[PDB]
Amino acid sequence: ARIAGVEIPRNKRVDVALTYIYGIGKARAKEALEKTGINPATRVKDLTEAEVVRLREYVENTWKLEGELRAEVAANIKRLMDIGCYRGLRHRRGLPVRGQRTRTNARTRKGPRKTVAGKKKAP
Amino acid sequence: MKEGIHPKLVPARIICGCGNVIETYSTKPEIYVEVCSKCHPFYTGQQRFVDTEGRVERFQRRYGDSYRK
Amino acid sequence: PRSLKKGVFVDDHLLEKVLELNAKGEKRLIKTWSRRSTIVPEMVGHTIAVYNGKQHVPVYITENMVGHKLGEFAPTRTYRGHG
Amino acid sequence: GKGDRRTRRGKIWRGTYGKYRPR
Amino acid sequence: PLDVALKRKYYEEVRPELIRRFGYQNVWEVPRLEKVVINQGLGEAKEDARILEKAAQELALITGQKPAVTRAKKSISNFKLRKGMPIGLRVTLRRDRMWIFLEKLLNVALPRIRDFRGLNPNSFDGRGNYNLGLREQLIFPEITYDMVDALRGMDIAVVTTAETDEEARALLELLGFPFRK
RNA sequence: CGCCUCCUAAAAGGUAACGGAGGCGCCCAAAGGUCCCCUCAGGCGGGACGGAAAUCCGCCGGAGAGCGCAAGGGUAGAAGG
RNA sequence: GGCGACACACGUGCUACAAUGCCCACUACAAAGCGAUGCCACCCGGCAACGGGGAGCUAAUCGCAAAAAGGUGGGCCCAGUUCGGAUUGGGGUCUGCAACCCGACCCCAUGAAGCCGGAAUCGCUAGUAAUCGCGGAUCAGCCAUGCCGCGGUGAAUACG
Ligand SMILES: [Mg+2]
Ligand SMILES: [Mg+2]
Ligand SMILES: [Mg+2]
Ligand SMILES: [Mg+2]
Ligand SMILES: [Mg+2]
Ligand SMILES: [Mg+2]
Ligand SMILES: [Mg+2]
Ligand SMILES: [Mg+2]
Ligand SMILES: [Mg+2]
Ligand SMILES: [Mg+2]
Ligand SMILES: [Mg+2]
Ligand SMILES: [Mg+2]
Ligand SMILES: [Mg+2]
Ligand SMILES: [Mg+2]
Ligand SMILES: [Mg+2]
Ligand SMILES: [Mg+2]
Ligand SMILES: [Mg+2]
Ligand SMILES: [Mg+2]
Ligand SMILES: [Mg+2]
Ligand SMILES: [Mg+2]
Ligand SMILES: [Mg+2]
Ligand SMILES: [Mg+2]
Ligand SMILES: [Mg+2]
Ligand SMILES: [Mg+2]
Ligand SMILES: [Mg+2]
Ligand SMILES: [Mg+2]
Ligand SMILES: [Mg+2]
Ligand SMILES: [Mg+2]
Ligand SMILES: [Mg+2]
Ligand SMILES: [Mg+2]
Ligand SMILES: [Mg+2]
Ligand SMILES: [Mg+2]
Ligand SMILES: [Zn+2]
């Protein structure tokens, strides 16, 4: 487990590799490398352990990441449910939270179609 | 101990990123580690990292008491 | 969300009901049609009856729910499910 | 892609500007 | 025998403190480590890859001690288990090799644990022994991502001469066991 | 319809009925000889995946486990591993 | 308050599954329209949505304005990826009396299904189809991927 808790992929560039960490999008990648002064274009295989620890030390202390971030995200959702606002209610039943229609679609939140019998027609 | 089946434990030095150095015994002579006891947030004081937040919310919100009196 | 350049919004006609209460010694049930009002630190410990479109829903207010609107705690539709 | 707001092409599609598409 | 940092710490730092905390009248009354027992519950190797010498060799790397196999005591239909199948590895660490393993465990292994925030204060035997379970074996310094086929976890038994939970806790705490509460 | 086990069977043995209940017509090159070593089931507590039950640790636990297959007898001071 | 519901089912579409592609920088070539509590040059603050300033134009003059695919340079190297951009956490902006139900944006983080789609079925005969961007009407704002239009690039095939 190199950094933060994860092993970022060798043979790809640092700026891309950092993104594989939960909590680092491409934007935080560019800024971290700038702030610690490492080339964004250097393959992970080709970093001095000096570069490794410098990049490592920065990233973990600057932002909350991986598990801790997930936990903090979890506490937020948990809070909404417990109070419990309409937003919290939506998380209970696993419906969309941001005002999307549910007559159709919503498959990402609702999941696979549970097909059901319809209404029969006359003969 | 039984001959032939066990791996030799030798004097070994484990090195952390925080510059910590540990004198111990291992199957490997030298080992480099990302973290150790000496620098791990839970171990070191209470080095609360990025999260001082607790948590904050909700009525640290303030900003302000502007709605009139 | 509402631009913070502008002020945090409450209807005032509901806030004054609360503030008059704070003086005389609370509480009293408060009937309101202001779902659109923000929950405000002076409202904690009260119970405000938000009207969902059909009924006045009693809502007790605590610190953990300060930043929200009152209507957020009085859902407008009833579901239960299908079949 | 056009549905990616976090890109030039995406901001063009939505007809808006920002960090990812400046004016 | 040899000098190991954690062992010395037990004799000069931990032993006097324990007498202070509990007031033993006999030099043997005071808590000791008896043995540390490590177990890879396995059985993922019951039928498929019917032999995982890989787990043994990698366990051998960490402890310096080659584990012995444990075989099923009875056949169990639901676990797809025939009596006598090789379904575990166990190694018993005593004396120096116990100290050395505990030393690296406290110094580097536990810190490597994912989202680690201390051990469980409640995992005490009731009879003054302790157990903890690991889910990854790469947590140990002499095991790396490159050398591993699949993640294997383990069970660790630390056995003390202490009669009670209270005495054993102080020992493990004084030795450097980090507890969440 | 021959053979094994229990009861009937009246505290030696034996004892009948189209009396009450089961089992056998095999098996094992180790499941045989000997030497050496080892001790169960179960219960509570502890432990990643792991469950009522896999493997690990501790305490209690004289035999209630096991001994290829019915039943009975025997049996860990072993016939069990 | 609801018309915005959601175990489900259908139509019409949008965005894709990638290298004849994706990205960043740099550099070109349209047309038709719209515009006085309107379009807003340019300056500065903000990573930014925007905000404060602040000229010009009652407009073949001033502005919306950059057209985009393209062209040039470099990066990515076949990966559920620098493909895809749904979903969700957080923080902001603007219109508006007011964005809880139920607005559009911007930013950090998240990065789902999807590897070209069963039976079946649609459109188009040339500046057409495909593909690329632009404008308007409605309109405070906007759920427009809709509609009506405008140009850019530009095929394949018709035996019968
Ligand atoms: Mg990331
Ligand atoms: Mg809806
Ligand atoms: Mg030795
Ligand atoms: Mg007040
Ligand atoms: Mg993208
Ligand atoms: Mg003493
Ligand atoms: Mg306990
Ligand atoms: Mg003990
Ligand atoms: Mg390691
Ligand atoms: Mg008799
Ligand atoms: Mg006789
Ligand atoms: Mg036999
Ligand atoms: Mg023998
Ligand atoms: Mg148990
Ligand atoms: Mg497993
Ligand atoms: Mg028995
Ligand atoms: Mg039988
Ligand atoms: Mg309608
Ligand atoms: Mg559409
Ligand atoms: Mg208009
Ligand atoms: Mg994926
Ligand atoms: Mg998939
Ligand atoms: Mg991606
Ligand atoms: Mg949000
Ligand atoms: Mg709204
Ligand atoms: Mg492919
Ligand atoms: Mg395609
Ligand atoms: Mg025709
Ligand atoms: Mg396209
Ligand atoms: Mg348009
Ligand atoms: Mg409009
Ligand atoms: Mg919408
Ligand atoms: Zn360290």
A80 touches strand G (CB under 7 A): yes
**Which domain range does residue E148 map to?**
2-181
Tell me how many domains chain E contains: 1
Neighbours of chain B (3+ CB pairs under 8 A): A, C, E
B31 CA to G14 C1' distance (Å)? 55
Domain borders along chain C are 8-83
Identify the DSSP state of C55: S
Domains of chain A, with CATH numbers? 1-71 (1.10.8.50), 72-123 (4.10.910.10)
Q: How far apart are the first and last CA of chain A?
A: 67
Q: Is C64 exposed, middle or buried (0-12, 13-18, 19+ CB in 10 A)?
A: middle
The CATH code of the domain that includes E40 is 3.30.1440.10
A112 touches strand G (CB under 7 A): yes
* SS3 of residue A99 by DSSP: coil
Neighbour count for residue E130 (Cβ, 10 Å): 21
Name the nearest CA neighbour of E139 among E43, E79, E58.
E58
Q: How was this structure determined?
A: X-ray
Q: Are C60 and C47 in contact (CB under 8 A)?
A: yes
Mutate which of A7, A64, A70 to disrupt the E interface (most E C-beta within 10 Å)?
A: A7
Strand blocks (E) in B1-69? 10-16, 21-26, 30-33
Residue C79 to chain B, least CA–CA distance (Å) = 30
What stretch of H or E contains C49? strand C47-51
Give CA angle at E90 (E84, E92), nearest 5°.
140
Name the nearest CA neighbour of C34 among C78, C65, C77, C69.
C69
> How many angstroms is the resolution?
2.4
Q: Is C29 exposed, middle or buried (0-12, 13-18, 19+ CB in 10 A)?
A: exposed
The dotted CATH code for C8-83 is 3.30.860.10
* SS3 of residue A68 by DSSP: helix
- Distance from Cα E138 to the centre of ligand 9, integer Å: 5
Residue E69 to chain A, least CA–CA distance (Å) = 29
Identify the DSSP state of A44: G
Using CA atoms, how far residue A90 sits from A39, A97, C35, C55, C57, in Å, is 45, 6, 18, 21, 19
B24 to E5: CB separation less than 8 angstroms, yes or no:
yes
CB contact, 8 Å: A38 with chain B? Answer: no
B2 CA to G32 C1' distance (Å)? 93
Of A79, A83, A89, the CB nearest to C75: A89
Ramachandran bin of A99, using left for φ above 0, alpha for ψ from -120 to 50, beta for the remaining angles: left
SS (H, E, C) E85-136: CEEEEEEEECHHHHHHHHHHHHHHHHHHCCCCCCECCCCECCCCEEEEEECC
CB contact, 8 Å: A92 with chain C? Answer: no
Residue E144 to chain A, least CA–CA distance (Å) = 8
